[PDB]
Structure formats: structure tokens, C-alpha cells
Design an enzyme around this catalytic site. Structure first.
Site, PDB file in Angstrom:
ATOM      1  N   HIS A   9       0.817  -1.217   0.000  1.00  0.00           N
ATOM      2  CA  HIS A   9       0.000   0.000   0.000  1.00  0.00           C
ATOM      3  C   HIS A   9       0.860   1.281   0.000  1.00  0.00           C
ATOM      4  O   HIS A   9       0.665   2.175  -0.832  1.00  0.00           O
ATOM      5  CB  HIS A   9      -0.987  -0.035   1.164  1.00  0.00           C
ATOM      6  CG  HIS A   9      -2.049   1.019   1.093  1.00  0.00           C
ATOM      7  ND1 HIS A   9      -1.804   2.377   1.074  1.00  0.00           N
ATOM      8  CD2 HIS A   9      -3.386   0.878   0.944  1.00  0.00           C
ATOM      9  CE1 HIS A   9      -2.954   3.023   0.959  1.00  0.00           C
ATOM     10  NE2 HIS A   9      -3.928   2.135   0.877  1.00  0.00           N
ATOM     11  N   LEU A  70      -3.990  -8.087   3.050  1.00  0.00           N
ATOM     12  CA  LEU A  70      -4.726  -9.165   3.696  1.00  0.00           C
ATOM     13  C   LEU A  70      -5.990  -9.540   2.930  1.00  0.00           C
ATOM     14  O   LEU A  70      -6.326 -10.726   2.802  1.00  0.00           O
ATOM     15  CB  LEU A  70      -5.111  -8.807   5.132  1.00  0.00           C
ATOM     16  CG  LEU A  70      -3.978  -8.829   6.155  1.00  0.00           C
ATOM     17  CD1 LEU A  70      -4.423  -8.247   7.500  1.00  0.00           C
ATOM     18  CD2 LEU A  70      -3.305 -10.178   6.265  1.00  0.00           C
ATOM     19  N   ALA A  71      -6.744  -8.535   2.526  1.00  0.00           N
ATOM     20  CA  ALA A  71      -8.039  -8.658   1.891  1.00  0.00           C
ATOM     21  C   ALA A  71      -8.146  -7.899   0.576  1.00  0.00           C
ATOM     22  O   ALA A  71      -7.199  -7.217   0.166  1.00  0.00           O
ATOM     23  CB  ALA A  71      -9.082  -8.157   2.879  1.00  0.00           C
ATOM     24  N   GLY A  73      -9.776  -5.086  -1.846  1.00  0.00           N
ATOM     25  CA  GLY A  73     -10.355  -3.768  -1.730  1.00  0.00           C
ATOM     26  C   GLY A  73     -10.202  -2.989  -3.017  1.00  0.00           C
ATOM     27  O   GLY A  73      -9.823  -3.534  -4.050  1.00  0.00           O
ATOM     28  N   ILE A  74     -10.499  -1.688  -2.950  1.00  0.00           N
ATOM     29  CA  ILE A  74     -10.400  -0.867  -4.159  1.00  0.00           C
ATOM     30  C   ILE A  74      -8.969  -0.877  -4.747  1.00  0.00           C
ATOM     31  O   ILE A  74      -8.798  -0.885  -5.971  1.00  0.00           O
ATOM     32  CB  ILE A  74     -10.951   0.550  -3.890  1.00  0.00           C
ATOM     33  CG1 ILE A  74     -11.211   1.318  -5.197  1.00  0.00           C
ATOM     34  CG2 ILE A  74     -10.140   1.332  -2.899  1.00  0.00           C
ATOM     35  CD1 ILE A  74     -12.215   0.643  -6.149  1.00  0.00           C
ATOM     36  N   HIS A  75      -7.925  -0.880  -3.907  1.00  0.00           N
ATOM     37  CA  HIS A  75      -6.532  -1.000  -4.343  1.00  0.00           C
ATOM     38  C   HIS A  75      -6.308  -2.261  -5.168  1.00  0.00           C
ATOM     39  O   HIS A  75      -6.012  -2.239  -6.367  1.00  0.00           O
ATOM     40  CB  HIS A  75      -5.651  -1.027  -3.101  1.00  0.00           C
ATOM     41  CG  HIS A  75      -6.273  -1.805  -1.985  1.00  0.00           C
ATOM     42  ND1 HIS A  75      -7.142  -1.235  -1.081  1.00  0.00           N
ATOM     43  CD2 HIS A  75      -6.189  -3.113  -1.648  1.00  0.00           C
ATOM     44  CE1 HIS A  75      -7.573  -2.163  -0.247  1.00  0.00           C
ATOM     45  NE2 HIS A  75      -6.992  -3.306  -0.552  1.00  0.00           N
TER      46      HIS A  75
END
Ligand SMILES: O=C(O)CCC1=C(CC(=O)O)c2cc3[nH]c(cc4nc(cc5[nH]c(cc1n2)c(CC(=O)O)c5CCC(=O)O)C(CC(=O)O)=C4CCC(=O)O)c(CC(=O)O)c3CCC(=O)O
Lengths: 119, 119
Positions: A9, A70-71, A73-75
Site C-alpha cells: 500500500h 490481507l483482503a 479492496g479498491i486497491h
């Protein structure tokens, strides 16, 4: 002939990058990939586009990109596929392979239980 | 007598909460903790204050809070300690113990390599 690119990120803090750097060091020690690079989605260098080019410049024709998230998302769903040019950067006839995030792996539960006990 | 509370970031997407829910379910199957709860920092319910109260209401006197985050950041260093009142209404006979994030664990490298190979 193939490269591993770990993407993260990024942060205004240094902890996120230190993590990716340590992760890349530990992967390199395992001697599975010829080329290993990191890129950070925001705030920091190397950026994701720079890492893919470094990999290409070292002579990789297949670039395995693993989202160290981890999950979903939008990224992982929009922002990163776009930087890789996978959704509407010049991939020079090379193949980019976009892998899956960490998810709710049994080894994460193992880690969580250790952290709970201060280990 | 003691509770495990897993706290996660939260997302406008459903993927972040599902992870925490699967993680809580897997930990529960291990039968180590009397009380297991999840809380999300943003966007989603249960919220972090709600999880700590749910834990207290079942009778926990020691609340182990584990940040299910890969790395340190403003959330794990400022925003979340704040919600926990470490920097709302906490009984005096109850102590909150705030644990560490996942960090650059060997088990993460293991996971990353599997993901690289599409496993
Ligand atoms: O406006 C502000 O700056 C204040 C709020 C703010 C900052 C916090 C701050 O700087 O105060 C914060 C910082 C970071 N957010 C983290 C995580 C993500 N936030 C979620 C959503 C986004 N939040 C954005 C803004 C905030 N970003 C935006 C706008 C944007 O990024 O474009 C949205 C996207 C919405 C959209 O674009 O439509 C998402 C996406 C999702 O989950 O879908 C997650 C990533 C997965 C996750 O972990 O959930 C992380 C990584 C971590 O914490 O794990 C960092 C860096 C580490 C750190 O915080 O040191």
C-alpha cells in the site's frame, strides 16, 4: 526469465515499506526467483510502475505480481490492476501475472494466536 | 475471564469484514479463548468500541486486542489506541492489552510464495 514483484500500500510512515523490504529479503534467501522487486502503491518509492520496469530491465519475460494485502479492496481490485495496465506503463511483450492477496489463510490464524500471547 | 478481540481496518467493500469473520470462526474452532469478538475501525459494524463492550458484557476481565494489520501505521499507532482509550467507558476491574500487528513473519513469506505459484 520470470520476476516476483511484491506490491504494498505505502504509508506516510516508514513501517509499511520496511515490511516489504524485509519480506523481499526473506524471499531472496530462498532462491526460487531470479529477480525480486518491491513497489508501493502510494507515498513512497519504488512505485509499482518502477518495480515492473526494473524487473523488465533485468530481463524478465513473466512478471508475477503478488499483492501483500490481507483482503481485497479498491486497491487490489481497481487501483493496482490499472497501474499494471490490466484494466482501462508499457509492457514490452512480457506477460504480467496478477496473483491473489493473503486472505484468511490457516497460517494467519497461527500468527494471530501467537500475537495474542505476546509471542 | 479473558476475551480475544480481532480489529481490522474496514472497507466500503465487503472483503475486509468477511476476512475478520472467517478469522474469528477459525480461532473459535481452536477452543483457546472463552470469548472471541471482531471490530472494524471504519465503514462497518461491528465497530471497535462495540466489540470491546460485547466482550465486557459476557464477563471478560482481560481484553486481548490483536491488530489484524500487516504493518504499523497511523491506524495501529494513533487511531486504534485512541478508540481503546489508551491515549469508551472501561470498568476498572477490566484491563485492555493491545498486541502487535502481523509484521514480516516467516509464515507470511510462506504464504507469499504459495500465492506466487497460484496456490
Ligand atoms: O484521507 C485520508 O488520508 C484519511 C484516511 C486515509 C488514510 C489514513 C490516514 O492517512 O489518515 C489512509 C491510509 C491508509 N489507508 C489504509 C488502508 C486503506 N484505506 C481504505 C480505503 C481508503 N482510505 C483512503 C483514505 C485513507 N487512507 C482512501 C482514499 C485513497 O486511498 O485513495 C480510501 C480508498 C477510497 C477510494 O479511493 O475510493 C482502503 C481501501 C479499501 O479497503 O478498499 C484501505 C486499504 C486496505 C485496508 O487496509 O483497508 C492504509 C493501509 C492500512 O492502514 O492497512 C493506509 C496507509 C497506512 C497508514 O494508515 O499509515
Amino acid at each position: 526469465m520470470e520476476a516476483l514483484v511484491l506490491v504494498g500500500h505505502g504509508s506516510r510512515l516508514p513501517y509499511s515499506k520496511e515490511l516489504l523490504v524485509k519480506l523481499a529479503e526473506k524471499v531472496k534467501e530462498r532462491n526460487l526467483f531470479p529477480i525480486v522487486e518491491i513497489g508501493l502503491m502510494e507515498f513512497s518509492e519504488p512505485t509499482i510502475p518502477q518495480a515492473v520496469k526494473k524487473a523488465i530491465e533485468q530481463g524478465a519475460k513473466r512478471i508475477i505480481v503478488v499483492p501483500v494485502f490481507l483482503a481485497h479492496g479498491i486497491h487490489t481490485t481497481r487501483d493496482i490492476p490499472r497501474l499494471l495496465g490490466l484494466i482501462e506503463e508499457i509492457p514490452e511483450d512480457v506477460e504480467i501475472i496478477y496473483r491473489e492477496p493473503i486472505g484468511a489463510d490457516d497460517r494467519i490464524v497461527d500468527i494471530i494466536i501467537d500475537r495474542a500471547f505476546g509471542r
